[PDB]
Amino acid sequence: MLSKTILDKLNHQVNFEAASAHLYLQMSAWLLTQSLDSTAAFFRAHAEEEKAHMMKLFDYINETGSLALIGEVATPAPEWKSHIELLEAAYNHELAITQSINDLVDTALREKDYSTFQFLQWYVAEQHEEEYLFSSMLHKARIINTMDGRALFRFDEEVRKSV
Amino acid sequence: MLSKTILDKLNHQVNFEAASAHLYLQMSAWLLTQSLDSTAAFFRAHAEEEKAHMMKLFDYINETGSLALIGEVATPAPEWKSHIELLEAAYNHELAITQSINDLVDTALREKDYSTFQFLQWYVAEQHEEEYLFSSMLHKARIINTMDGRALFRFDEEVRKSV
Amino acid sequence: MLSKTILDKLNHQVNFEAASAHLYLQMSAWLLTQSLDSTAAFFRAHAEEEKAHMMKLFDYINETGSLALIGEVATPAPEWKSHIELLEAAYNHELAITQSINDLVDTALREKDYSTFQFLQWYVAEQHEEEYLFSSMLHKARIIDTMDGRALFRFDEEVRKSV
Amino acid sequence: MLSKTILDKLNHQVNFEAASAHLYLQMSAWLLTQSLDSTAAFFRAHAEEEKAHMMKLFDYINETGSLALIGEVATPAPEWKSHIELLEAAYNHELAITQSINDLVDTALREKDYSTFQFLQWYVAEQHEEEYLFSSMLHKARIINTMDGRALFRFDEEVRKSVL
Amino acid sequence: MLSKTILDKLNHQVNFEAASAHLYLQMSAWLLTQSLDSTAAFFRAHAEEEKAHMMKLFDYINETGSLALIGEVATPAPEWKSHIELLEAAYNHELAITQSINDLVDTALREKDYSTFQFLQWYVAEQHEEEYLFSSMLHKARIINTMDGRALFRFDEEVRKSV
Amino acid sequence: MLSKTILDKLNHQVNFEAASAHLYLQMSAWLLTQSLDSTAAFFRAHAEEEKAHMMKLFDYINETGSLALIGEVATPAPEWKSHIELLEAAYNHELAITQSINDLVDTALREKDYSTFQFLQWYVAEQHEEEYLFSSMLHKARIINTMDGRALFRFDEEVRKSV
Amino acid sequence: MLSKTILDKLNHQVNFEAASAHLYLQMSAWLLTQSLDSTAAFFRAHAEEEKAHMMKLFDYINETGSLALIGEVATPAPEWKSHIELLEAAYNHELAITQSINDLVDTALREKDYSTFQFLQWYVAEQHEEEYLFSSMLHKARIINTMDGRALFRFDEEVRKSVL
Ligand SMILES: [Fe+3]
Ligand SMILES: [Fe+3]
Ligand SMILES: [Fe+3]
Ligand SMILES: [Fe+3]
Ligand SMILES: [Fe+3]
Ligand SMILES: [Fe+3]
Ligand SMILES: [Fe+3]
Ligand SMILES: [Fe+3]
Ligand SMILES: [Fe+3]
Ligand SMILES: [Fe+3]
Ligand SMILES: [Fe+3]
Ligand SMILES: [Fe+3]
Ligand SMILES: [Fe+3]
Ligand SMILES: [Fe+3]
């Protein structure tokens, strides 16, 4: 049976993952106005990943006998001036999610709620994959924004085809 | 291409469908605290249906060249005192969705936006199925809440097995 | 070839079977307003059986070289005050159909129309199955209307599952 | 949920489709007395189509929470003096059904019952296929009733075998 | 070659198993007049099992070179005032069959007819299964005859569905 | 629905078919003592046919809403001095069954119980097959009991093999 | 390799899981005397799960080079006055198993026996599933023990058949 401090943080995380899904949907919509159709598709698909993260928390909470709460989710209209600004926002958002998961893990360990600690390892692992994915996409966007960079990528693509 | 009045209403509907998904998730969670597991599963699954309704609007808006907006979605904590009160809320919520769709259809017809009019016919048909589903579930819940009612259903179940 | 007296009775039976189909359709519609969905489905399906009874008579008449006549079919609006009253009506109606078939069989025998006599044996057999079906459904409805009865059926269902 | 005016018209249509099924059964029976066996089979099969039209209305009404009503269906005995007179009756009947559907669509639009309006679009489409089917069958009957017409159809049949 | 005392008892058992089949048929018929269709089907199917018990004794006797005798089988008309009274009769009847088999086994052992002793082990085993089946059905009928009992079974059924 | 006179006769027939099964079982057992193993197998199998005749009547009676009654079945010990005497008894027994079915058919026709009349046509047809079977077996037995007869059959068997 | 304090606790847990299996067998036997056949079958099957929990600990201990010990397992005769009292005992028993596993995890962490810590994560996860299972079964039993409760479940079952 979940302590109140852990419950509140798990419910905060449910709400955070829900907000991520909506954020990525909104990014997708903006990207389509820039004709960045593949990046839009990526964010659309990834919104569906964030919905799965949400549901898995939601279920764990309910299975423990507490009541999961969705809360308020507010998605700001698209401010972004360029695709790089959007990718920076996405990456920082994923860093903040990782922070939140780490806090949650730390507090489960501190309260000796080992059940929540082991449940959260899935998220710790997933956030490693998320940071890798989003940092890497940002890094490429910055490179591809330069002519020297576009030449590097042309070589890399030649290697992908030739060998 | 989309007029501002229609765009604002379509985006309102996007947000309304998003709120429905979250509302039904929240109902599902509450139902699990009552040990109403099958009803909880129904609402969980239906939250996924509302998400599909949302995405289909979202796409139509983006395909027309406008920018779909998710907005703010606020889900109140579970007030419900019984499963009947929750079913009443779900049914009324579906009526309100139908109202909103009808207002949208009416306004498309009035502006001679025939493209949005025909796109919405899917929703007009879907809301007929939704009202049937939720009214019927509420009616049964009220009947099953009385002893006379539980006797009717016992006969109906005998007919389902016997013939 | 068919005598006028036998033709007029066969055409009466065509019309009677048509009226039965419409009756059972109407009963189905009423049962849906009571939320007796399985009973409604039974009466809907059975309306299709009555249509088959009709068509088989209709074809026999036409094959003999006479002209089958549908006539007027009038279905009274739903009077029924309970599902038991409806089942009583259905059972009495099936008794009347059997009476009508028996009169028809008797008159074919009396006129030595052995062809019509043998054609009707299918109906004599079918009406035995109909009476069994409808009497049995009525009997169960009367039993299930009592608390003692619902306890008997709970045991019978335990036997269906256990052995 | 359904307004009374729409409910009454949908129930009228239920009854009208039921009367069509019976009408076409009766036509089938008459056609058999003329040894027009294929035309009889067509009308028999089409009576089954009219039943499906009926049931679909019936179900929509019941799904909305109202009570569908079958009503009285009266089928006059076969008056018809020729197959052409019968085909004219069938075609006019189908024109009347279309009228009745159009009235129903128009009244749903006027009351802003968009749910009934969209449900009826199936019927609007179906009645276009019905008018095409019956008008075309009538037209061919009139042509075939003339010697010049039979010659046209003999050529058309030669094309069906030789090329198409 | 069978002793006269063993032969007479084996033939008595043949007749007893025959009487059981007829008894269970008669019970089946009565149960149908109470609309206990599943219990009726059980007794009908079980009459077939008793016939198989009869035939297996019948064959053993004939294979040893003696002449199996069916004898007189008298089945009283249905006295039963309730399904529980009928189940009590069925259980007691099975207890009497077991007694009769045990007497038969005991006599074979006493006369050192080891062939008949080993043949009868099948029946000893089968009667354990019969007593389990019939005692269990009686017990459940008594429980289900009460409101507290019907609540226990409702929980048990929930466990059958949930886990 | 069944008249008392028809019910009593149907229940008589139930009992008669039951007695036939037991009679043929008893004949089978006697035949085995004469080493007539194939004839014994025929009677054993045919006892199963008589059980089916019984069950079909039993079911019809119950389906009409009356209570089928098995009654007393008494099987005399085997008197038979030869296989021919047994075959004569079997044939005469089948003649008596046919008589009993005919009386039953005649009574149904007289009371205008057309439902029982048509149900019985199956038995009228089956008894034609039964009389053919048993008369033919008796006739062959009488022929084979003579040396002239065994010579005829030796020729017939030659024709079965040669052509 | 295993410290004596960890070894003694792992062997205690081996013995605890063995006792659980026997407890659930004994509950199964009692439930059969009440004609609660499905609940009996559940406890019987679950005794087999507890045996698997036992064997997995037993194997880990042996793989580390220490000697696993079964010990004494004593199963009291069935005291239970109702199925609810039995389900309460089962649930509390599972809570006590969780407590032991948590103590074991906690002491592995203190001693920096990370190997035993990671091995035990399986049990931490499993005991979450166990508590869910048993608490939920208890909660339903309490609800079904009331007439209002049986009415709720009748509705829930209608939803299982009609929609889900
Ligand atoms: Fe996430
Ligand atoms: Fe993420
Ligand atoms: Fe929706
Ligand atoms: Fe909806
Ligand atoms: Fe009929
Ligand atoms: Fe009928
Ligand atoms: Fe039509
Ligand atoms: Fe039409
Ligand atoms: Fe036996
Ligand atoms: Fe037995
Ligand atoms: Fe027979
Ligand atoms: Fe026979
Ligand atoms: Fe365990
Ligand atoms: Fe456990």
State the Cα–Cα distance between residues B139 and D145, nearest whole angstrom: 61
The residue among D65, D68, D133 whose CA lies nearest residue D98 is: D133
Inter-helix orientation angle D83-110/D114-144, to 10°: 160
Across the interface, of B36, B45, B153, the residue whose CB is closest to G156 is B36
Indicate yes or no: CB of C102 within 8 angstroms of CB of F112.
Answer: yes
Residue F72 parent element (H or E):
strand F72-74
Indicate yes or no: CB of C78 within 8 angstroms of CB of D72.
Answer: no
Which residue type occupies B150? R
- Binding positions of C for Fe(3+) are 17, 50, 53, 94, 130
The distance of Cα A29 from the centroid of its chain, to the nearest Å, equals 17
User: Residue A98 in contact with residue A127, Cβ under 8 Å?
Assistant: yes
State the Cα–Cα distance between residues F153 and D7, nearest whole angstrom: 83
Task: State phi, psi for G104 to the nearest 5 degrees.
Answer: -65, -40
User: Could you tell me the distance, in angstroms and rounded to a whole number, from the CA of residue D98 to the centre of ligand 7?
Assistant: 8
Q: If you count residue pairs, one on B and one on D, with CB atoms under 8 Å apart, how many are there?
A: 25
End-to-end CA distance of chain F: 57
Sequence-distant (6+) residues with CB within 8 A of F39 are F31, F83
State the Cα–Cα distance between residues G112 and G116, nearest whole angstrom: 9
State the Cα–Cα distance between residues C130 and C16, nearest whole angstrom: 15
List the beta bridge partners of residue D72: C74
CA angle (C120 as vertex; C119, C126 as ends), nearest 5: 120
Inter-helix orientation angle B147-162/B114-144, to 10°: 110
State the Cα–Cα distance between residues F146 and A77, nearest whole angstrom: 112
- Binding positions of A for Fe(3+) are 17, 50, 53, 94, 130
Residues in D closer than 8 angstroms to C74, CB to CB, are 72-73
For the record, the structure tokens of D54 come out as 């009926």
Task: State phi, psi for E72 to the nearest 5 degrees.
Answer: -100, 135
Task: Report chain G residues touching chain B, CB-CB < 8 A.
Answer: 136, 139-140, 143, 151-152, 154-160, 162-164
Task: Report chain F residues touching chain E, CB-CB < 8 A.
Answer: 18, 22, 25-26, 29-30, 32-33, 51, 58, 62, 65, 67-75, 77-78
Sequence-distant (6+) residues with CB within 8 A of G33 are none
State the Cα–Cα distance between residues A99 and F112, nearest whole angstrom: 91
State the Cα–Cα distance between residues C13 and C146, nearest whole angstrom: 38
Q: Longest Cα pair distance anywhere in chain D, in angstroms?
A: 59
End-to-end CA distance of chain A: 56
State the Cα–Cα distance between residues G36 and E148, nearest whole angstrom: 13
Q: Hey, is A33 helix, strand or coil?
A: helix
In CATH terms, the fold of domain C1-163 is: Ferritin (1.20.1260)
Instruction: Quickly tell me which residue has 């030869």 as its tokens.
Output: F82
What sign for the dihedral angle of Cα A127, A132, A135, A137? negative
Chain F neighbors (3+ CB pairs < 8 Å): C, E
Task: State phi, psi for E2 to the nearest 5 degrees.
Answer: -70, 135
Inter-helix orientation angle E147-162/G114-144, to 10°: 140
For the record, the structure tokens of C49 come out as 């059986």
Residue by residue, DSSP assigns A42-66 as HHHHHHHHHHHHHHHHHHHHHHTTS
Q: Hey, is C1 helix, strand or coil?
A: coil
The residue among G87, G122, G117 whose CA lies nearest residue G104 is: G117
User: Residue E73 in contact with residue E22, Cβ under 8 Å?
Assistant: yes
End-to-end CA distance of chain G: 53
State the Cα–Cα distance between residues F160 and F154, nearest whole angstrom: 10
Sequence-distant (6+) residues with CB within 8 A of E104 are E6, E9, E10, E13, E116, E120
User: Could you tell me the distance, in angstroms and rounded to a whole number, from the CA of residue A88 to the centre of ligand 1?
Assistant: 17
Task: State phi, psi for A82 to the nearest 5 degrees.
Answer: -150, 165
C touches A, CB cut-off 8 Å, minimum 3 pairs? no
Burial of E125 per CB tally in 10 Å (0-12, 13-18, 19+): exposed
State the Cα–Cα distance between residues A108 and A8, nearest whole angstrom: 12
User: Residue F70 in contact with residue F14, Cβ under 8 Å?
Assistant: yes
Q: Is B111 annotated as a binding residue?
A: no
What sign for the dihedral angle of Cα B27, B33, B37, B39? negative
Residue by residue, DSSP assigns B64-126 as TTS-----EEE------SSHHHHHHHHHHHHHHHHHHHHHHHHHHHHTT-HHHHHHHHHHHHH
State the Cα–Cα distance between residues F13 and F59, nearest whole angstrom: 12
Q: Hey, is F73 helix, strand or coil?
A: strand
User: Residue C151 in contact with residue E144, Cβ under 8 Å?
Assistant: yes
User: Residue A50 in contact with residue A17, Cβ under 8 Å?
Assistant: yes
State the Cα–Cα distance between residues C122 and C120, nearest whole angstrom: 5
> Given this structure, which CATH class describes domain G1-164?
mainly alpha
Q: What share of chain D is helix, strand, coil (3-state, %, to 5)?
A: 80, 0, 20
Inter-helix orientation angle G147-162/B147-162, to 10°: 40
**Burial readout A9-21 (b: 16 or more C-beta within 10 A, e: otherwise):** bbbbbbbbbbbbb
Chain D neighbors (3+ CB pairs < 8 Å): B, C
Q: Hey, is F66 helix, strand or coil?
A: coil
For the record, the structure tokens of E110 come out as 């006493």
List the beta bridge partners of residue F72: E74
Experimental method: X-ray
Q: Encode chain G in three state secondary structure.
A: CCCHHHHHHHHHHHHHHHHHHHHHHHHHHHHHHCCCHHHHHHHHHHHHHHHHHHHHHHHHHHHCCCCCCCCCCCCCCCCCCCHHHHHHHHHHHHHHHHHHHHHHHHHHHHCCCHHHHHHHHHHHHHHHHHHHHHHHHHHHHHHHCCHHHHHHHHHHHHHHHHCC
For the record, the structure tokens of B47 come out as 């939250």
Mutate to test the interface with C, among F118, F119, F120, F122 (most CBs of C within 10 A): F118
Annotated domain spans of chain B: 1-163
User: Could you tell me the distance, in angstroms and rounded to a whole number, from the CA of residue G63 to the centre of ligand 14?
Assistant: 23
Burial of E39 per CB tally in 10 Å (0-12, 13-18, 19+): buried
Burial of G67 per CB tally in 10 Å (0-12, 13-18, 19+): exposed
User: Residue A133 in contact with residue A45, Cβ under 8 Å?
Assistant: no
For the record, the structure tokens of B154 come out as 């016992």
The residue among E56, E52, E41 whose CA lies nearest residue F55 is: E41
State the Cα–Cα distance between residues C144 and B158, nearest whole angstrom: 9
State the Cα–Cα distance between residues D138 and D149, nearest whole angstrom: 13
User: Residue D16 in contact with residue D102, Cβ under 8 Å?
Assistant: no
Strands (E), A72-124: 72-74
In angstroms, the separation between the Cα of residue C64 and the nearest Cα of chain F is: 23
State the Cα–Cα distance between residues A145 and A153, nearest whole angstrom: 11
Residue D74 parent element (H or E):
strand D72-74
For the record, the structure tokens of D49 come out as 């189509």
State the Cα–Cα distance between residues A18 and A20, nearest whole angstrom: 5
User: Residue B128 in contact with residue C106, Cβ under 8 Å?
Assistant: no
Q: What share of chain A is helix, strand, coil (3-state, %, to 5)?
A: 80, 0, 15
The distance of Cα A134 from the centroid of its chain, to the nearest Å, equals 8
User: Could you tell me the distance, in angstroms and rounded to a whole number, from the CA of residue C100 to the centre of ligand 1?
Assistant: 73
Distances (CA, A) of E116 to E1, E122, G140: 10, 11, 54
State the Cα–Cα distance between residues B26 and C100, nearest whole angstrom: 60
User: Residue D41 in contact with residue D100, Cβ under 8 Å?
Assistant: no
Residues in F closer than 8 angstroms to C105, CB to CB, are 114
Across the interface, of F64, F65, F118, the residue whose CB is closest to C124 is F118
User: Residue B28 in contact with residue B3, Cβ under 8 Å?
Assistant: no
In angstroms, the separation between the Cα of residue D5 and the nearest Cα of chain C is: 18
The structure was resolved to a resolution in Å of 2.6
Sequence-distant (6+) residues with CB within 8 A of G14 are G54, G57, G58, G61, G68, G69, G70, G71
Task: Report chain D residues touching chain C, CB-CB < 8 A.
Answer: 18, 22, 25-26, 29-30, 32-33, 51, 58, 61-62, 65, 67-75, 77-78
User: Could you tell me the distance, in angstroms and rounded to a whole number, from the CA of residue G90 to the centre of ligand 14?
Assistant: 9
Residue by residue, DSSP assigns C46-101 as HHHHHHHHHHHHHHHHHHTTS-----EEE------SSHHHHHHHHHHHHHHHHHHH
List the beta bridge partners of residue E72: F74
For the record, the structure tokens of F61 come out as 């009676």
For the record, the structure tokens of E88 come out as 């009590």
**Burial readout B143-153 (b: 16 or more C-beta within 10 A, e: otherwise):** bbbeeebbbbb
User: Could you tell me the distance, in angstroms and rounded to a whole number, from the CA of residue D48 to the centre of ligand 7?
Assistant: 10
**Burial readout A99-129 (b: 16 or more C-beta within 10 A, e: otherwise):** ebbeebbebbeeeebbbbbbbbeebeebbee
Breaks (C-N over 2.5 A) in chain A follow: none
Instruction: Quickly tell me which residue has 């007439």 as its tokens.
Output: G147
Mutate to test the interface with E, among C146, C158, C161, C162 (most CBs of E within 10 A): C158
Residue by residue, DSSP assigns F38-58 as HHHHHHHHHHHHHHHHHHHHH
Across the interface, of B61, B67, B75, the residue whose CB is closest to A70 is B75
- Binding positions of D for Fe cation are 17, 50, 53, 94, 127
State the Cα–Cα distance between residues A102 and E11, nearest whole angstrom: 83
List the beta bridge partners of residue B72: A74
Distances (CA, A) of A33 to B58, B63, D115, E34, G125: 13, 10, 34, 73, 46
Phi-psi label, residue D146: left if phi above 0, alpha if psi -120 to 50, beta otherwise: beta
Sequence-distant (6+) residues with CB within 8 A of E141 are C155, E83, E84, E87
Chain E neighbors (3+ CB pairs < 8 Å): C, F, G
Indicate yes or no: CB of E75 within 8 angstroms of CB of F78.
Answer: no
What length does chain D have? 164
Indicate yes or no: CB of A75 within 8 angstroms of CB of B72.
Answer: yes
Residues in A closer than 8 angstroms to B65, CB to CB, are 33
State the Cα–Cα distance between residues B62 and A28, nearest whole angstrom: 10
User: Could you tell me the distance, in angstroms and rounded to a whole number, from the CA of residue A17 to the centre of ligand 1?
Assistant: 5
End-to-end CA distance of chain E: 56
The distance of Cα B30 from the centroid of its chain, to the nearest Å, equals 18
State the Cα–Cα distance between residues E79 and G4, nearest whole angstrom: 74
Q: If you count residue pairs, one on B and one on C, with CB atoms under 8 Å apart, how many are there?
A: 44
For the record, the structure tokens of B94 come out as 């579906």
Number of neighbouring beta carbons within 10 Å of residue B136: 18
**Burial readout E67-97 (b: 16 or more C-beta within 10 A, e: otherwise):** ebbbbebebeeeebeebeebbbebbebbeeb
The residue among B107, B93, B80 whose CA lies nearest residue B53 is: B93
End-to-end CA distance of chain B: 56
Residues in A closer than 8 angstroms to B73, CB to CB, are 22, 72-75
Residues in B closer than 8 angstroms to D120, CB to CB, are none
Indicate yes or no: CB of F75 within 8 angstroms of CB of E70.
Answer: yes
Indicate yes or no: CB of E34 within 8 angstroms of CB of C163.
Answer: no
The distance of Cα F50 from the centroid of its chain, to the nearest Å, equals 7
Burial of B13 per CB tally in 10 Å (0-12, 13-18, 19+): buried
Task: State phi, psi for F34 to the nearest 5 degrees.
Answer: -95, 5
Mutate to test the interface with F, among E39, E69, E86 (most CBs of F within 10 A): E69
State the Cα–Cα distance between residues E80 and C149, nearest whole angstrom: 17
Sequence-distant (6+) residues with CB within 8 A of C133 are B163
What sign for the dihedral angle of Cα C137, C139, C145, C149? negative
For the record, the structure tokens of B91 come out as 């049914």
Which residue type occupies E11? N
Ligand nearest to C-alpha D51: 7
Breaks (C-N over 2.5 A) in chain E follow: none
Q: Hey, is D58 helix, strand or coil?
A: helix
Instruction: Quickly tell me which residue has 């998320």 as its tokens.
Output: A130
User: Could you tell me the distance, in angstroms and rounded to a whole number, from the CA of residue G62 to the centre of ligand 14?
Assistant: 22
The residue among C127, B156, C155 whose CA lies nearest residue F118 is: C127
Inter-helix orientation angle E114-144/E83-110, to 10°: 160
Indicate yes or no: CB of B45 within 8 angstroms of CB of G152.
Answer: no
In angstroms, the separation between the Cα of residue E141 and the nearest Cα of chain C is: 6
Residues in G closer than 8 angstroms to A118, CB to CB, are 121, 124-125
In angstroms, the separation between the Cα of residue C145 and the nearest Cα of chain B is: 6
State the Cα–Cα distance between residues D130 and A82, nearest whole angstrom: 57
User: Could you tell me the distance, in angstroms and rounded to a whole number, from the CA of residue A53 to the centre of ligand 1?
Assistant: 5
In angstroms, the separation between the Cα of residue E30 and the nearest Cα of chain C is: 14
State the Cα–Cα distance between residues A87 and A23, nearest whole angstrom: 12
F touches D, CB cut-off 8 Å, minimum 3 pairs? no
